[PDB]
């Protein structure tokens, strides 16, 4: 391969989902946590079972 | 590695401020009062881009009605006579005729008054 022509295979590497970077991303303004609640908090949620 | 964003923000705001020319005072100088008015301006634009057609149709119709009353007939009976006589003349055209060529409009009125 040539270093100025590199490519991966399709579907091998995916673009990260950045969160809280505008409304038109979809993951913005709440980060997929929804409206208020214990799940909508830093370190929120509950135990695992 | 660190990212500052000196130019992105400024360019993105100059765009809005260029869109905000002609606006009273703060609404062409400040990004917030402008943006809040650019979005409302676009809303109004999208809406007026529909109401424009309504308005001109209304105008044309009033003109046609006037030009028909000056021949002894009304908009509604005129247009019904036209639909009878299979005369597919737009109202824009018909208003232009009523303004400029009253004789052509009078001929159309004769056609309709015969159709009725």
């Amino acid at each position: 391969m040539k270093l100025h022509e590199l490519k991966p295979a399709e579907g091998s590497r995916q673009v990260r989902n950045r969160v809280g970077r505008g409304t038109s991303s979809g993951n913005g303004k709440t980060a997929g946590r929804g409206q208020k609640g214990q799940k909508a908090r830093s370190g929120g949620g509950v135990r695992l079972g | 590695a660190r990212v500052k964003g000196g130019t992105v923000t400024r360019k993105r705001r100059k765009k809005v401020l260029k869109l905000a020319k002609g606006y009273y005072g703060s609404k062409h100088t400040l990004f917030k009062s402008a943006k809040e008015q650019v979005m409302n301006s676009y809303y109004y634009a999208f809406r007026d881009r529909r109401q424009k057609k309504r308005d001109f149709r209304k105008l044309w119709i009033a003109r046609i009605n006037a030009a028909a009353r000056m021949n002894g007939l009304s908009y509604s009976k005129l247009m019904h006579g036209l639909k009878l006589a299979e005369i597919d003349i737009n109202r824009k055209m018909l208003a232009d005729l009523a303004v400029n060529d009253a004789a052509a409009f009078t001929a159309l009125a004769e056609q309709a008054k015969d159709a009725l």
């Binding site: - | 105008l59 046609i64 006037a66 232009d96």
Partner: protein, 145 residues
């Protein structure tokens, strides 16, 4: 695009006359307001005042049907507390028929700079005085309209 817009000032303005010996003021004022707006023409565009002038005659004799002569009340307020004045249309007819016809037409016009100007084109006169013989006005038949 293409469709005609009457240049402000270029439309020629005619002078009309309306006798009102027996007509209702509402119907009178309706045809009159149409004229003043200039909707009687194809040149009408709604921002340039394409209308014509109106003279009104024998406004004292304007017909009021039913009890409107004694029960159609014109209210106005001085915007001072308690300053509500009422006047009947009959008294207003006998005394200031100009004001009667004016209130009718003014309510029947638009509440714009344009309509405030168009209300100036009106010229009401009780009786057949007609001081405007210099403008060569034309009689208009309300009965057909």
């Amino acid at each position: 695009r293409t469709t005609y817009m009457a240049k402000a000032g270029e439309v020629e303005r005619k002078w009309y006359v309306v006798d009102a010996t027996d007509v209702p003021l509402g119907r009178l004022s309706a045809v009159v307001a149409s004229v003043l707006r200039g909707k009687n023409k194809p040149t009408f565009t709604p921002h340039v005042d394409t209308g014509d002038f109106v003279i009104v005659i024998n406004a004292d004799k304007v017909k009021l049907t039913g009890k409107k002569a004694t029960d159609k009340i014109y209210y106005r307020h001085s915007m001072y507390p308690g300053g509500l004045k009422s006047v009947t249309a009959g008294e207003l007819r006998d005394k200031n028929s100009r004001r009667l016809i004016e209130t009718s037409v003014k309510g029947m016009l638009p509440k714009n700079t344009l309509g405030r100007k168009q209300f100036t084109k009106l010229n009401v006169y009780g009786g057949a005085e007609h001081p405007h013989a210099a403008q060569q006005p034309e009689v208009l038949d309300i009965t057909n309209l």
